[PDB]
Structures are given as C-alpha cells and as structure tokens.
Design a protein around this nucleic acid. Structure first.
Length: 204
RNA sequence: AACCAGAAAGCCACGGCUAACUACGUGCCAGCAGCCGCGGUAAUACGUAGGUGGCAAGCGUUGUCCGGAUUUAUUGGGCGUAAAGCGAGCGCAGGCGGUUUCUUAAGUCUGAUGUGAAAGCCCCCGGCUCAACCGGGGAGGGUCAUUGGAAACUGGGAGACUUGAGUGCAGAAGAGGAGAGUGGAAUUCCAUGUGUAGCGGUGAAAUGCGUAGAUAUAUGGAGGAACACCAGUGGCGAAGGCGGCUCUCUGGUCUGUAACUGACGCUGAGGCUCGAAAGCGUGGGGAGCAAACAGGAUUAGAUACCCUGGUAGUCCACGCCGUAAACGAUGAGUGCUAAGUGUUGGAGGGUUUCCGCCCUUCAGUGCUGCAGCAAACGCAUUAAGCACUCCGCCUGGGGAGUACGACCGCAAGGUUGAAACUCAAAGGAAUUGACGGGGGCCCGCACAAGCGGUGGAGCAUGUGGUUUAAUUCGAAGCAACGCGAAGAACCUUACCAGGUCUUGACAUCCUUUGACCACUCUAGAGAUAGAGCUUUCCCUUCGGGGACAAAGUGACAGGUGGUGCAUGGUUGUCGUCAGCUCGUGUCGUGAGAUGUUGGGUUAAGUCCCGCAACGAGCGCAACCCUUAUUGUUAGUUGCCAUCAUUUAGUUGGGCACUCUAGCGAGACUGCCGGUGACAAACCGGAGGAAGGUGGGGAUGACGUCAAAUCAUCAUGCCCCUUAUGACCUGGGCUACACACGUGCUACAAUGGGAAGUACAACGAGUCGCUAGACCGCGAGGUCAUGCAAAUCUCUUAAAGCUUCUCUCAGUUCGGAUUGCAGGCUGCAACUCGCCUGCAUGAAGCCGGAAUCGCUAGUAAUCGCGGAUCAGCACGCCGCGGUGAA
C-alpha cells in the first residue's frame, strides 16, 4: 500500500476542515466531545444517512449544521423529531446546541452515499460487477467527468481474496486543481468483510 | 337391445452435448458418470417437494449389425516439417504408348425375340367399420442368351513417315575408376657438436620427464601417415564418395550436323550388382592420434568433463557383414506456364591488337521475386503450379520394429513382421507472457577519482544461544537486528511465587426498590471484613421515571487465545524506475499486430523528422510549500537614521533603514552568435539576485513478493467461562560460559591544563520557565520579581580569539573500574534513576581479510531546541557555526 487519502492532500488549499474552532486550554475535551457528537448520528444513518456535519462554535454556544440528500426523516413530521434530537444531544452535551439542516443538490454526485448504497446492495447478495457498472452509469447520467470504483476482499461469497474494480471518464488524481471526492465503506453479507471505494471528478 | 362415464392409464431423466428447475437436511467419506468430469458445510449428480420434459401399455439397461466415418477415399484421401519416396543402380515377367492408308471387328453402342417362379419392398384401384388379407398392371430380378447392323477409339493383320529413341564424323571440359612409380615440408626416433637447472601442464595445482646431461640449437640417418597456398554456392560421378606429381587400360556427359536405322520407348514386383564409419577372419606395419585401462586433480560423491601415459583400431592385400540424421527428410519419364541477376562449359552473329566487349542460343549451377499452391513456414523453368504413365509406402500414441515362423551370416546381427492389454490423447505451425548459466544499447556514489569511516581498543544499545519459576509477543537477504518501545522501580503487562473473587473487573432489561456515596477506627501484603455521621427526590392533578445504589436469577459479559495461507483497513520493496492502456480506421483465415516501431535529442512514451495510422486517458511535466530580490500596505511588545536624554532606544519623537506578513512584480530558451536537415536540441554571450526543470520538499501508475500486521482497530471460523476471566503484594522482561549488527569516547602537539575575551537559528512555557539576592567544593539550598507572551524566562551557545603551560613518554593523553561523602523527584533508587565531590587510573600510540556513506553549504567537526516525561537519551525529530578533496 502506498496511496494517500486525497482529501488530506487538498485540505487547507481548496477546502477547509469540519471544525472551525480556535481553542486553548479546553481543546482535547471538545475533541473527545466532538468524537461523541459524530457517533450519535448512527441513529440518523440507518435512515437519514447524512454526508457531512459542519460544526462552528461561538463563545458559549454550540452551532452545528448538516448536509444530506434525504430531508424527509430528519425534519420529522412537524419538526418534533428535530427538537427531540436537540434534547438527546444536549443530554450528552449540557450546552446550547442549535442544529440546522441544509439540503444538497444533484444528490447522486456524492462520495459517501454512493459507496453506502453499493455496500447496501452487497449486503443483500446482489452481484458486484453489474452493481458497480449500473452505479457508475447512473453517476455518469448525473453529469460528471469521471468515476473510479474498486472492491476487495472475499468477493461474491468465495474463497481467498481478489480485488477488482472498474472506471470510466477521466480522473486527474495527481493534480491539485482537482476538487475531487473520496469515500471508503466496509461491507459484509455474512462472509468475512469487504470494502468499497469511490471517486468523482468535476474540475476545480 | 334396457342402464354407467362408472368397470378402465401408464413409465425415465433436468452441470454442458441434452429441448426438458428450483429449493431444502448429505459433507474429497459414502457415492455418480456415454464423453467432458463432480464430492472438504451446497450435490442445481443422495433423499424430499412440487414441478418440468418425452411416446400413446409401455419404459429404462445389456448385447449384436448399418449410418454419421471422405476413419481404406472407384464414385470419394494422401507422402518437405504431422503416420508415410526403398541408400542407390542394372534389368526377366507385367502395365502403358509418336503420325498415317487399307482391313478384321475382340472390346462398343443399338433394334427385335426368350427368360429373370410364387410371395415381398413400390404405385393405382376395391373390399377387411382404419392395422393386417387378396385381386390386375408395370421399371423390379442379367456382366444374361440368340439373331441384324458402326468402324469414330483401343486391341489384331498388311503397309507408309521422321519429330521420339540410337550409331555417324567433327570437337570440348573434368579431385570418374583401377594399376604401377615418384616429390618436398612437418611430427616421432637415433647419432653428433654446442650448452646447464629445469622442462611440461592448469581456473588453480598435481601426476610426469631431467646431473645415467633434459629441454633448446646446427648436421645428418630411419620409418609411417596425410597432401600447405591454388580452392571458388568451382568440377566429376547413379549414390556411398573423389584434391601432391608422372605414366598404361578404361567408363560416362555436353556442342555441331544429318547422309544413315525407322517407334526399336518409359517404368519396372521377384533376381543381381554397388554401397560412409564401426565390426569379424588370415598375413603384414605402427609417425601421430586414441575406445578399454592406470595415475593425478575437481566434487558431498564423479566408475565423466580437466592433465600425464597407454592397447585394440585407424593403413595395405584377400574374404565376410550390408547398416547411417545413407537428407534437398522432396521416386522416376515427358510436356506446358512472367521477369532480373551472378557463374561453369559450348556454338553463332556485330565489332575487333577481342584477350577484352555487345547481341542470339544450348547444357548445368546459385540468388531474388508474378500468377498459382499451401494450416502456416514457405515453394516458385533445378516447382512443393497445371497435368498423364509406372513403381514404393501410410490409416491415433504406447505395446514394438518386440514374439512366433521363415531366409541370410563364423559372430554381432540383418530382412519379412502381429496380437493380448492400456491411454484420451500424442502431433505440426504460429501468437502473447515468463525465463536463460544467450546477445546488443542505456542509466544511477554502481564501478573508477578522492574524503571520512566500520572490522583492532573501551563503553552504551539491539538480536541468536544458555538460563531460571518467569527471562511475556512480533519482526529473519536486500526489503529483520538505537525495529513495534516518541521514555519498564510499583502502575506500566501479557511472564512467574503467593494471597485471593465470581450475571462477575465492564455493557443492557426486569422487579424489589428508588437515589448512592464519601469519610474515621481495627486487622493485615492487599483484595476485603466489622462498626461509626447518614444515606435521598430536582413532577406530586395522593396516580411516577428520569441522577442513583444493593439483592435474585434470568438474559449475558470477558479472552493481549489460534488462524495475515479465510479478511477489511494500513505499510514496506522494485522506485520517483518510465512505463501502462483505450476509441476509430487498417493488416492477419485466427489467437492477435500496427499506434507504443526507426533517426536525432532529453531527467522522462519529453519533443522534431520518416513511417496505415489518426487521436485520447492514467502516469511524466504544470498548479502547492519553503528559500533567493523588490514595490505597496500597516508600525507594537519591533527598529534608531533627524535631534536630546539615560547604565542602556531608556523617555520625547519618526516609520528612515531593519524586521514583522498581506497583496503584488520578477527567469519563460526571454534576445544575440555558432553547431544541427533549416527540426527538436547542443555550445557560448549581454542583462540580472539567481539562466538553462535557480536550490530543496510534499506528490509514488500498471503491477511483483500468499512480503508484515487478529498485539492500534474491526473481524469469517475454532476453542476457554466459580475460569486461559478478574483484584492485590513481591519479583522479571535489566541474567551471561558465548558469536553478530548498530552508535558514543580515545589511542595526544592543528593537543591537553589555567587565565582573560565575541557573533546564531528553531521552539517551549500555569501548577510550567525562573530575575535578582544570600550561602555552599559542587550536584544545589532559601527568600522571592517577571511571565497565559516580538515584552519574562529557558539562554550570556561550543569550535572560537590572545598569554602561559607541558616536551613524546602508556605520558598533566586517555577515562573505564572501585571505596568514601553527597545532591535531587519519587511513599520507595537492593534487584533497577540521574548528577556532584574526594581517593583510584585499566585497555588503548590509527586497527588484516573485507566492507560502508558521500559530487558542495555537501562530506568532516562543533554546539542548541523539541516529542514522550515526577524522574531518567551515546536513541529519534529539527535548527544553526566553521567549511573541504
């Protein structure tokens, strides 16, 4: 293995972090509290399945916001689930949290959601070649410049591991005026454990 | 004729061929199969389930005959490499044959006549209410038999012709054959002279020969074998084969020409002859060379390769055997079908001292290439092309050219030549990878040139081995060994001795209940035990759970236990090596190829030119960070130039310089000259701070190694559970008869010791760095001031510079080891921290074989800061000074 998480290459240059803090003498407390913050959307991710959470911070307030493609289950029926999530998050926090919902557009051109969906087809015993090809076509139908895909492990419920994936379009990986995305996700039907990786490119 | 759909349906397969399915318990065992092949938690091959799928009382299995099988090919196959042209010639019998006149009519076709039993298979028509039965007709049963005709073709008879086939006469070439003599050189032996300590051989040596005079050098003498240059893809012959020269017998081929014979030809089973080396018998000679054999060497072993010897043989005469990779792996005879180019032997013409030259034509003999053939490679007037005549041979690989029988031979052996039983392949040619102890080109501190090192000595540190009760686990060539460990006294821990415990040390629910705790005393090594103060409601609609404990068992928990060869994720390594592919159009019967090859150039698939290729993508490069100049902006905690002050840029003042860091400019072959195809590019010059990607960093394609990891994490499967799980004390991973790797300090004079004396950069700081003062030989101790930061501290850096010193010694070098006295953090430095002082003073005078790093702010030397951290660094990460060959 030799390659790099590409979002860890472009950060600081053409994007930022997801924590816009500046904190001395209470830094690791908020770090291992934000670690607890990220875990709590496991209740979301089974249904709501958000992508990113941006957490800014005022003096004595908590001011967070999310990005997702499914605005249905996150807004509740009348916002009543929203205040319940604020209460359950504040029970772990004790501090004034003020959550927000931002909807993404052209939602098929994500990174985490497409890999999560193809891992979902892997968790229903659907064949890997046809699912990757229909996935990269329906991502190409969204309008892009390229998608790379790769899956590994004990493929298709078999013996000793292979690793193979397919690609189409262009993808300048080694260049810095890129604005690409990336996502890794596990997979298991019942045998061992697998993994999917997924790439896009849309110019700077 | 009275009443019923009641009395009244069967059988094998479903992985491909094979139309004709899906799912459940079975687990390389039991099993299945016509061929291909299936069985280790899947058998879509055992049983079950519905189905599915087939003809019409049947359906599967075994056995036998024909087809598919052009796999005996007459219709209808072949022999360069896949099975398959005898080793080659001479020829009896046989097969097949130039043109023409007349003639017979054997073969040939045809007319008529006689028969080819009945029943069958056919067709038409009737009945059998449709299968079966009969009836009348016709090809159906001949290579038939008799009688009558044609002479086109082949047989037969009579003749005719010269084109095929042979002797003329004239020439020509030639390692054609046998027999008889002869020439010189070279080796070996012998003799003679001269002349002394070695000669000979190998990768390296050794065996061997030599003072009983070798080797070497000149002179002769003996004998055998082979013929240096000429020598050529030249020549000769049916093949095997044939090269010094002179002579006798003798075979064959080519060119002219035509008076002469007049179809006399070709092929050729049986038979005969010739037939490389090796071998056999009888008799000769041995100069070399050399099977068998002896000795030396190599090797784990070497009944071989290597070296020193050495017989049969190799030679001649006379007999025998009769084989070869006897090959162009291509049978023989004849005819026909584009060119170009050498060369051997001729004939003719133009021209001519032709000896050259040019044109025409015969027989060989090479080389390149149309049509045509071929699975391809290839062949191609010397066909593997289009054909006719005759002969030989083949029908999957093994068994095996074996067995029996027969013939030949003195003998080895030769010629002719099967089956029982096995296998589902064996085989030819070409394409892509991979490999080679095959080759051509390139490139890197890879060699070479230098500089400094390691291996010698002392110490620190990491492995293997021995150890104990335990020395906890992983990592093994580059690509493990100052590596996970960026901090082992208890904790750290998994390793031991002991004290111990159990829905548990930790998670979720249920009820009883609701909130606990926390803290003092006693026991002890501790977990724990027994008391003590009591615990505690945050909604009250008398109705209740949220913050909480304890008890019950219930769910369950826990594993640093195994498998990186069941895994994800992550990382080494080729290696910053320069490659890896796609679309469209072309080539190839097809796998596939071309683009991506060739010339130049570059750090590079980077770019130019030619090229059935044209374009693109991932890589390379560019965008990113820092360093190298300058403009603007903004001036404190920064700096001091215009002046005063004060120890002092301090305080008045300015943003001038410096610095701080935002936005900007600047280096792109940018211009000129030469080289280069004018092209890419190469070499110089000016300008500038840097000119040829200015100097570094981050960035790591396709893929290789089942490389490393369950011991960061997650985890398929397997195992443990009043215990391999948990709590505590003490110990250990820090041992040492030994060997290896990595670092620190010296072996002193460019130096040690004493004194005085200057200049950096990065970063860190709240229970953290310490200003100043006092005391101490010191490690340091006390009072205390600044500091959450360009301000206060770490912190005034070492090598540096000037004076003295020592005077070559195991030394005023060196500084390990050991007693004593201490200092600091720790609850506690014995096992096991660091540092100070006194007393002690070992090896060690530049380190073999071998081996490592590095092409310039580099190598070499010298200090400083940080991470983890109460404490502990010769390790790691980073910065700066001096500065090489």
């Amino acid at each position: 293995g030799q390659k790099v998480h590409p979002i860890g290459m472009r950060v600081g240059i053409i994007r930022d972090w997801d924590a816009k803090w500046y904190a001395e003498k209470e830094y690791a407390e908020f770090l291992h509290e934000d670690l607890r913050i990220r875990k709590f959307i496991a209740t979301k991710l089974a249904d709501a399945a958000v992508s990113t959470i941006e957490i800014e911070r005022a003096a004595n307030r908590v001011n967070i916001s999310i990005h997702t493609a499914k605005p249905g289950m996150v807004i509740g029926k009348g916002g009543s689930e929203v205040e319940n999530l604020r209460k359950e998050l504040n029970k772990l926090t004790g501090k004034r949290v003020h959550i927000n919902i931002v909807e993404i557009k052209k939602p098929d051109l994500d990174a985490k959601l497409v890999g999560e969906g193809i891992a979902r087809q892997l968790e229903n015993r659907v064949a890997f070649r046809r699912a990757q090809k229909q996935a990269i076509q329906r991502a190409m139908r969204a309008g892009a410049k390229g998608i790379k895909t790769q899956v590994s492990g004990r493929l298709n419920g078999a013996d000793i591991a292979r690793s193979e994936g397919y690609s189409e379009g262009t993808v300048p990986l080694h260049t810095l005026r890129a604005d690409i995305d990336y996502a890794w996700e596990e997979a298991d039907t019942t045998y061992g454990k697998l993994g999917v990786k997924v790439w896009i490119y849309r110019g700077e």
